Write a protein that binds this ligand. Structure first.
Ligand code: FMN
Ligand code: FMN
Ligand code: FMN
Ligand code: FMN
Lengths: 362, 362, 362, 362
């Protein structure tokens, strides 16, 4: 009769009921037959928890740090493009909620709000820029320079998207932005993903990527980026230990173990399953983060037990927006925070420093 | 047309048909997505039986002992709170059925009948008290002293509930006691869980626990309890071998391998799967019991084969109450007894002493 | 519109459509939650075939022998009680079909036709008696002596039924014989399972067994039987290697690896899964047979690859009867024969002697 | 409203909607309970991809070679009988599409178009003949000689069909050719599979095979074929390493790891699962190919990672025909090509030579 939403799945169900089909499908979809999409969630269930009893959990402290900046909890907002499709306030709502929670927001290069607009809305929020390497390196450099100028604290360079994955619903729906919206970090019709522009007869976004994003990028482009900015840089989308070691060798400052929300290559493993290999490979030299399939407090606990410093959430944030903008994002983050606090307490962990590998077994 | 209930699942189906939704949901629920709830049952199915033929099973003897007290069968009633929601006679019905069967009843601290009332109803019944450590240690001590005075033979201290688990239906339903009922071991409105008292806008019971139950408890509180009473004490809710060894070191007299009916931390293993680790860890120094998912005679057989002295049943007892009070509990216990007798006979076991590890393989 | 039944599953579907519910349920059921019933079939699917190509399979020879008697195929009829419930001609139809096919029939002690009647109907058929050890050993001896006199060639002594398993539908349905039928090997109202006799308020057959069948039997009773008859004796219902070795030590002549069609102890392994252990344990000293879940030619092939001499089929035969008596049983046996011939041919096997362990992998 | 078919599964769904039931069922079916049919697809999903990032995939080159002949992609058309049932133009449509794509077509001996007709329609297409060994070796020789004369570049001799598998729908439907069609490589009523000819009361095709195809063939017949033609010969239908080694010893030039689209012996492994054993067994001495269950670009990638030179597709081609003849086949091949290109790019592979075993893990 009146929404009573008490877990992240409830927010998704609500979002499906209120969003236009093409928009819900864009946000929900994975690549191809969505094998990895299912596995990102199923894999968490296979990792079992071995809680310690009688540890004194009256005072739980969820605080930690990400690349040297304190956060209230090891749960941060990951980059999700074009948030104004979910709610009129989009990324401005999201950053305000992050400011309230004391956690960080990773801003998409494909945001429907500019780097500057987001900084103005959340001046005291911890903010990072997710970067795509455009064919036009002057565009790419401008994004980085604006992030520096506007008080962003890291670059998350996405390394798994030389081309866009094939999301079948987006092809069926001929996905494009609603008429009033643009990718607001760009000036030209092409780069702003104008829905009045020719992006072919399939997914508009796949065509956008083919036109705008450089499929040639290599470790040499990582060298270029490392020279361009002194900001911390995290490689986002690494799934192999050898690639993780290469990122460390290139002077990067973190790895975000990610399969892009299962939206790129289908049939890759779940992120929680590859996380241990990556943690082992980097030998403590950089922080390792995870995204993909985080929906519950126990997911966060499992990721930290396997050596992630923090996790990022994608889709849950857009479901929060779809419910009630800033307040909805606040709600989703508070649910995750409280579920994580309870999971910590019930497993005997007073703080994030005592979350150890003995807590989990596959 | 007329109930013909011949197995425990039939009693649950009947209970669902007659109980108010909020009450059925409270009794049925597990925590969060109920992964462990499903696994407590599924795990029993993965343990396969290797029966011996031609052993002479004309005389089966199901009798055993629990902490030195003889019982008619290795199947005992576990603590389930607030039984008068299922049937007007609640815990008084349950204890009378246990008296008839010759098995033991573990009484919840959160019973809708007092320690004294239950003793008066079942004077010759084997009875134990399940204890929660209240913030108020005077309350806690009074519970123990009353159990001693009223002829209870052990304390089962619950160690997995510093806070209540998150049972989604109880949040949705805003679970609370029916207006005529109270937790009858307590005098004050707060501690008696009065449904006229302010227990917030979510699960009333979760708020009750946050107000009443001490999240700080540690092994030091176990030391306090061990000094307080000379009764046998069993640690209820242990899932790790290291914790089991610590319980032995603290002078406790048993371990009840339990995930709290899958109602606390979701994603812990099934109790039948962790039982072998715990049996190995305690090296025969104390009795080890199991609860969680026992529905059939073969479940009992599997638990004993893996080294449990006895098992406890939770939900089946409340379904018995929902059917027909004392008679219904009697029925459920008799079904379990007869199923266990048949399973013993068909596997070549004349008595519980010959139920060996070679009977099972995972 | 008109039955077109081309595989064993089709015969079952037809049987369900024409038989009274209580009769279909009696024949179909397994014990308790029917975990083993499902597994008897599922386990065959997990054993994969590794066919050899280009072996010359123009001439396939399915013939073999069972306990020294030639059969046309390694597929024989297992004991299924009370066949006249499925078709007026019951066991007489079955034995005539076996005579036509050139395979053997194992006659139930609980047949609705006498040992003599079956011999008269199928004088040239290979016939064996399945024996239950009655409390009354004079009854038991009479069965054996009649089998000897009437040209039966072996005794299959059932060793897994000290009591009947708990088949839930039979309890719900209060299973008993139709009014015109009896267990025709017995004279008295009790032993003939008269439906006019008091067999309690649950399954009539469970009560019959409790009254008639001896739960005390042991290896000493096997010694008695071995002394009583010089006929070959097969132990039916062995699931453990140690028991198989004991059967060999007692001078028995075969083992039928059987979980009684999953009708006795639920949660035992599938017969195809325990067959290798039993074959290994007996070291070629006696023939090993399998029943349980055989529905297709590839099931037969898998069993022989893992070292069974022959398989027995239970339920498929009664579905044949339900369709069209003798002709229906003939049809089912011919389908199994042809499926087995094709499976042999496609796997490169010209005869049963070349069916080797390399053909299968789990 | 109007077909929008964007993946191979969409083409199948369309085909089911437009084809007569008997024709769709013939094309779709596997043998018996279709366990292998399901597994051919499911097995691909169990092999997980481990993509390399930042490799420079701006220029992807899909080209390779098959038995010394260049192809545009490692995706070729496998033999599927009687294609004119799907579309009036049948095999002529298929060969024209292959010519356009720059890939090869394997022509069925049971084609509804002659060897010569197909050569005339696709003179510049890479074409191979799939050969069945007929009882009549003069027929068999004529097929080979015509393939030689008409510019076919290899013989794929099918070695897994001494008899036809039992496809239940074909039995139910009494499958036969539509009245206007014939197997056009043959002159006589029997060998042309005339639907006016007596092929029994079950599957017409099973009876055709029993009459026409030689179940006696052995390695001696492979010796005969190797002497008959200097064309490259591939053994099609090998599932064992020992058989693969024998094919190499007989001077054959390739192995097509195939379970005949799961249409012959049911319960054999998926082809992707046996491929590694076969690749290892032949020690690089001949090319190894795969068919069975290829539906997506990632399937192609997985097969090449495990050492296949190329894959063949069966059913997808007939669904293309059912949609729109030549254009439909073109569409299906272009979808597979583009999916494969994207999978290569997202996994860091610029060309087929760098697709390595480290890309996959089961
Ligand atoms: C709707 C949507 C949009 C996304 N947009 C971007 C993006 O612009 N840049 C990027 O690097 N990753 C993007 N991602 C990937 C996310 O940063 C993140 O890896 C993913 O959402 C994590 O999985 P989850 O949705 O299961 O939490 C997107 C994911 C989704 C679901
Ligand atoms: C409705 C319900 C109420 C319970 N109340 C208590 C309680 O008051 N104290 C306690 O220590 N455990 C309690 N438990 C946990 C049980 O003692 C026991 O661990 C659990 O019921 C065993 O699993 P089963 O229900 O599958 O048999 C409760 C469980 C249920 C289902
Ligand atoms: C309806 C039915 C009746 C049976 N009756 C007997 C019996 O009288 N004696 C016996 O030893 N086994 C009996 N069995 C067990 C069978 O001999 C055999 O072990 C079983 O049917 C094999 O499994 P299947 O039905 O999957 O082929 C019976 C099984 C069924 C299904
Ligand atoms: C409808 C159909 C007809 C076929 N006809 C032949 C044939 O005539 N000769 C042959 O060697 N294989 C034949 N096959 C097997 C295919 O060559 C190939 O092994 C199989 O289709 C591959 O699996 P897929 O359909 O999953 O791609 C046929 C398969 C199908 C589905």
């Amino acid at each position: 009769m009146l929404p009573r939403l008490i877990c992240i799945n409830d927010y998704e169900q609500h979002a499906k009921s209120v969003l236009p089909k093409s928009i819900y499908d864009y946000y929900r979809s994975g690549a191809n037959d969505e094998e990895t999409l299912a596995d990102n969630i199923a894999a968490f269930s296979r990792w079992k928890l071995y809680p310690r009893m009688l540890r004194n959990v009256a005072e739980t402290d969820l605080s930690t740090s990400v690349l040297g900046q304190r956060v209230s909890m090891p749960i941060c907002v990951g980059a999700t493009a074009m948030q104004r499709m979910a709610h009129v306030d989009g990324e401005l709502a999201t950053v305000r909620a992050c400011q309230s929670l004391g956690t960080g927001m990773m801003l998409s290069s494909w945001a429907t709000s500019s780097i500057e607009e987001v900084a103005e809305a959340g001046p005291e929020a911890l903010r990072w820029l997710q970067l795509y390497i455009y064919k036009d390196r002057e565009v790419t450099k401008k994004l980085v320079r604006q992030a520096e100028k506007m008080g962003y604290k890291a670059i998350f360079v996405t390394v798994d998207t030389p081309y866009l994955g094939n999301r079948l619903d987006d092809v069926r729906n001929r996905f494009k932005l609603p008429p009033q919206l643009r990718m607001k970090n760009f000036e030209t019709s092409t780069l702003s993903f104008s829905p009045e522009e020719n992006f072919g007869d399939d997914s508009g976004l796949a065509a956008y990527v083919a036109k705008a994003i450089d499929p040639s990028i290599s470790w040499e482009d990582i060298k270029w980026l490392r020279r361009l900015t002194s900001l911390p840089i995290v490689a986002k989308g690494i799934l192999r230990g050898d690639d993780a070691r290469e990122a460390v060798k290139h002077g990067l400052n973190g790895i975000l173990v990610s399969n892009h929300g299962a939206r790129q290559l289908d049939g890759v493993p779940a992120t929680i399953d590859v996380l241990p290999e990556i943690v082992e490979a980097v030998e403590g030299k950089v922080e390792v983060f995870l995204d993909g399939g985080v929906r519950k407090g126990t997911d966060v606990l499992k990721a930290l037990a396997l050596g992630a410093k923090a996790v990022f959430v994608g889709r849950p944030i857009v479901w929060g927006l779809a419910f009630q903008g800033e307040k909805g994002v606040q709600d989703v983050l508070e649910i995750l925070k409280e579920e994580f606090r309870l999971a910590m307490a019930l497993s005997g962990c007073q703080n994030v420093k005592v979350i150890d590998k003995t807590l989990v077994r596959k």
